[PDB]
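Please, structure for the following, as tokens.
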Amino acid sequence: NKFAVSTISDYTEKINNVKDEEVDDLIKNINKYNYDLFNGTAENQLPDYLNIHEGDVLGYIEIPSINIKLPIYYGTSVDILKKGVGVLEGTSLPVGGENTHSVLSAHTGLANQKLFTDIDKLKDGDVFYLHILKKDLAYKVNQIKVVHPDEIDELKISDDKDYVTLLTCYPYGINTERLLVRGERTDL
């Protein structure tokens, strides 16, 4: 559990040493990217001017009901998913806003680390908290879905919705489906 702690501490130290202005310029660049993604005009890479690359720490997730506090990395790889939670490529960056749907991926049933093993315990009305680039965002669970992996490329940004989905492989030790726990933006 104390690997997540050190990564999150190092993140918190680094983001608190950036000028408020520089963080605000990054959040505007990200909001434009999320808008272009929603509008179908984004390329299949993040714009280079975001300076966000695969394995960069963007912040952390807390899921109070299941004792989860994990760092959030941009991208998904065998390496990121051994360590924490990955923003799925081609989904909204998790800074909130109407017309956003960020997908956060992590493993169920790894040997020595829980990660998203217990997101199958989450129910309508359970909250999770994102701490991303000095923004505090609250999400309340309002849907659970279990889908074939082909449906992940079919995931839609919903008009006028602010959604974050927690994605893991399902069922435990078999991993042929994807479990999707959808939160909708709520008051902190």
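The two ends are 25 Å apart (CA to CA). Residues 1-188 form one domain.
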